[PDB]
From a paper:
In the course of analyzing the structure and interactions of CTLA-4, which is providing important insights into avidity enhancement of regulatory signals at the T-cell surface, we crystallised and solved the structure of an Escherichia coli-expressed monomeric form of the protein (ecCTLA-4), which unexpectedly formed a misfolded dimer and both amyloid and amorphous aggregates under largely physiological conditions. A monomeric form of ecCTLA-4, which comprises a canonical Ig superfamily (IgSF) V-set domain, was engineered by mutating the cysteine at position 122, which forms a disulfide between the C-terminal membrane-proximal linker regions of the protein, to a serine. Immunoglobulin (Ig) light-chain protein deposition diseases arise when Ig domains form pathology-inducing aggregates; these can occur in a variety of organs but most frequently in the kidney. Our work provides new insights into the stability of immunoglobulin folds and the process by which they form disease-inducing amyloid-like deposits.
As expected, this construct was expressed as a monomer, and its crystal structure revealed the characteristic V-set IgSF fold. Although only one molecule of CTLA-4 is present in each crystallographic asymmetric unit, an unexpected swapping of the C-terminal β-strands between adjacent ecCTLA-4 molecules results in the formation of an artificial homodimer (compare the topology diagrams in Fig. 1b and c). The GG′ strands of one domain replace the GG′ strands of a neighbour, and vice versa, forming a compact dimeric unit. A structural comparison with the native, non-strand-swapped crystal structures of B7-complexed CTLA-43 and mammalian-expressed CTLA-4 (maCTLA-4; Yu et al., manuscript in preparation) which forms a quite different disulfide-linked dimer, revealed that cis–trans isomerisation of the prolines at positions 101 and 103 relieves peptide bond strain in ecCTLA-4 seemingly driving the strand swap of the C-terminal β-strands. As well as this reconfiguration, new van der Waals and hydrogenbonding interaction networks between the amino acids forming the (opened) hinging region appear to provide stabilisation energy for the strand-swapped ecCTLA-4 dimer, alongside the formation of the native-like β-strand interactions between the GG′ and F strands. The strand swap seen in our CTLA-4 structure is strikingly similar to that found for CD478 and also that seen for a llama antibody variable heavy chain, which was hypothesised to provide a basis for understanding aggregation by Ig domains. To investigate the possibility that the strand swapping we observe could underpin additional levels of aggregation, we incubated a concentrated solution of monomeric ecCTLA-4 at room temperature for 24 h, whereupon dimeric and larger oligomeric species formed. This indicates that purified monomeric ecCTLA-4 ectodomain can refold to a relatively stable strand-swapped dimer and also produce larger aggregates.
Numbering used by the authors:
A (entry chain D), B (entry chain D): 0 to 120
């Protein structure tokens, strides 16, 4: 596991419809085979998992049935939406982003060593 | 698969005991979980596999039972020996080196977005 910075807006005001949107950006190396986003909520020191989705870099996010969250990946971004919010749902919403890549594999082929063996008697 | 250069001596003279030794160097990225060396022989255009061994970077090589080949890995090197050679065993001996690494995995944890939700009436 290598650490990765994730940036997101410090504060967001949910609309009167109770829809809140924010972006979580990160500095990835390249095209991750997998990318898994998880939103956690902190209030009263208690941390809960609000939602989780997995997808391939570029391909669209999709959360579990009737999720609070909607999502859209565009490059080194995930654009989260969270709906149905009410007053008591105020708190700190944290992005956890996992990127997974294929195992490196190197093949080297040498030019050859001509081995000469003596025929004695 | 990424290509990798492998260098080895152009010519080697087997001793009167029929023991021939050569080094196959390569430019690897780092500590490969796996490293697999394979020696191929070319004569009359025909290519045969003379021997194969697998090991971890640093840890010692060991070939199949009663192998022609003996081996020792030291950094970015494999030091091959080949014994029991006779005249007809003259030919081009090629190093094939495979390096395998673990799948990259990045975890990013955001600082959080404080979401404020309005209590209406």
């Amino acid at each position: 596991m290598k650490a990765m910075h994730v940036a997101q807006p410090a504060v967001v005001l949910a609309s009167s419809r109770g829809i809140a949107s924010f972006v979580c950006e990160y500095a990835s190396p390249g095209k991750a085979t997998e990318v898994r986003v998880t939103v956690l909520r902190q209030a009263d020191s208690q941390v809960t998992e609000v939602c989780a989705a997995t997808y391939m870099m570029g391909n669209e996010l999709t959360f579990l049935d009737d999720s609070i969250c909607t999502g859209t990946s565009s490059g080194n971004q995930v654009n989260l939406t969270i709906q149905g919010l009410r007053a008591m749902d105020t708190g700190l919403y944290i992005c956890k982003v996992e990127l997974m890549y294929p195992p490196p594999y190197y093949l080297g082929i040498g030019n050859g060593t001509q081995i000469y063996v003596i025929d004695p008697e």
